[model samples]
Target chain A: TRDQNGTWEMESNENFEGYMKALDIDFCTRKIAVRCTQTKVIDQDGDNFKDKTTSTFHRNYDVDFTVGVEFDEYTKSLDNRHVKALVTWEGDVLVCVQKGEKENRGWKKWIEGDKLYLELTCGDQVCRQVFKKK
Target chain B: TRDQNGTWEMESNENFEGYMKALDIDFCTRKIAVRCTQTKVIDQDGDNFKDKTTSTFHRNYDVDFTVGVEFDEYTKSLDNRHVKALVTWEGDVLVCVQKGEKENRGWKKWIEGDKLYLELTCGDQVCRQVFKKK
Candidate 1:
């Protein structure tokens, strides 16, 4: 399914608070982030996918790149981490690895039915989130 | 007026074609630019101004900056020139000095009553444009 061209609402967020804690996010920011509504706006053109995760309470995230290409990513709106991120297709899932100062940092996203699934991993924490097309 | 908050539509464009030619713009792009409707969307906060000039025929331009700060600017839309831009208040006018490879490159913007005025200068070419608050 190559058509991810809509704004998707976050249906459920699992263990995101612990994942933020693993990223060393402060307690106040983590509390605010966990209680806010997050939406994913996915725009695909050819082989490149430009996606944004946005929250009205905080800032936004742009996890956009051409598949199989490595690029420098700065999480300026989130944890302010600078890392080299690479995206690739493994089987049917789109996977990303953020190689930086963190212990274990990466994420995997895939589409199923009308829902988008996200698995965020950092250190020992694993956060799973699902979104439905809005 | 220091408070520039409204969207402004182009009222008049003077010599913008010649100014684009001085920047070595292609003939096809320059022709399309001259016939497009240009609009300035201004949003100011604190000491920073976030302004955008958009056209349906071409990509948008962001000339946003904080006054009295020197920052690197890349004109990814208009001319693709990278320069160090410094903006400051001269009298009541906001003037930007783009120190780049081009000679005499910069612009000055000001609000007079219900109109916004722009003077885009590059090399020896000068283009004066006016906009009305939309």
Candidate 2:
């Protein structure tokens, strides 16, 4: 049982370009995104959590959800899709599922030591993002 | 140096739920996506490729791209975002970057043995998916 509350920074990505292609992202945007660094802020209160991702491109995304409860999400800056999202605890890992038009879209966040790991997926691609405490 | 032409079936997914939530999908879509199986058809001619992802949930995603060139991607059934996408080869890996509304969005695909590996990302979430030759 580890508390995942703090600021984290993006360190590395495995295959980001392929992911954008799968999502059907345009060229100009992919070029900028692949080179930009990102930051994450996480807050936790008992079973509730708030997550935020910020970048130098002047884009920031924030979300708040509780464990095992479903909520509506409008991915404004992201894909601009609407989905019902839910979070559940599986051991020390925080697992989430997004129900929407896409198939097999979801993410998992966990802490290993002081480093935070966030895995994002959409369609057939997966990107492993490692963030260090800031 | 590999010809990526054929059909591949989804074998396994590591932490897909988390990736979906990162995309802001709904509960019902996530539930069905987690259990459904997917198939990928790849047609390659030199550096140009056409990729199609088909699922039993009556949804299919298709894309056409060439190496080192960028294209417009409108994630029709997925997150429904418009992005500029580019693909390139890093050794045996096919890497792509998606520039769009979301920060840090992209994917990667490669071959390992008789299996295909696809990594998907949107924002800070990543999901790893494996597909076997079919």
Candidate 3:
């Protein structure tokens, strides 16, 4: 939603385990994921964007989408589930809706000063992450 | 490779089964793949490119890479193998090298007039595909 540029390093992560639990992730995987360090890289071209999220334990999650375009998003590795995803601008905040099995499944992205903020929500769980310019 | 803009539609394909066989793909999967219709979409930004190859029967294959950036490529669905892939320019042709289990594993891309050409190679098998600007 909010416009951000360049690479960003994770400054903080909160309640990510809760979000993963809502997604029915395995306990062993969640244990490893919560302890890993993450890095975020954003590539934007007008209304189109490519977001790459890398982690310490051999992880590369890249998602490319255009604003207002709805498409099928197959979460192959993370959850191995398929969902119809839509990215739309809600004011200055960029929000995505993953319409499928999970309720209120989506992520929000916005820029605050030199920090990039992300909020991932599913069901009653919400995970907040902050990233600083790298 | 040769610079061309916008979406492309596959016009012809040759030796695709031989290439799949070299990849050790199952006979049923290869039979389904060879009969599928493909659509190619190229999203270019300077030296960075995102290539999306979509086909009928719930298939979506997308790969994004910079001209000289090398990274790990996990072929999850098609091959289910991990490889270090590097893309480079050879004159107007964009070539890629997948250094992994398969020998001579790579693909070449180029443009001729309004037609885009792709040659996928594995072992001694070569599969050629032609796509026209759509």
TM-score of chain A of each: 0.56, 0.58, 0.57
Better of 1 and 2 by DockQ: 2
For each candidate, report its DockQ versus the true two-chain complex.
Answer: 0.01, 0.04, 0.02
Candidate 1: residue B33 Cα off by (Å): 42
CAPRI classification of candidate 3:
incorrect
> What range of 10 consecutive residues in model 3 chain B has the weakest lDDT sum?
B1-10
- Can you write out model 1's per-residue Cα lDDT over B59-105, one digit (the tens) per residue? 32334455677888876523556899887778767688999877677
Model 3, A1-134: lDDT tens digits are 22333555555555555444443455555665555555545564543435455544333334566667787888642345689988777776777898987667787766565454556566655655554432
Q: Which pairs of residues collide in candidate 1?
A: none
User: lDDT tens digits, residues A22-127, model 1?
Assistant: 3345555465455555455555454343445455332223344666778888854335568998877787676789898776678776656645555667765565
Off by over 4 Å in 2: A1-57, B1-134
Q: Can you give the TM-score per candidate against the true fold?
A: 0.31, 0.32, 0.32
Candidate 2 residue B124 C-alpha distance from true site, Å: 44
RMSD each, Å:
26.0, 24.0, 22.4
Worst 10 residues of 1 chain A by lDDT: A55-64
* Residue range B17-65, candidate 2, lDDT tens digits: 7666656666655665564555555565553435454544333344655
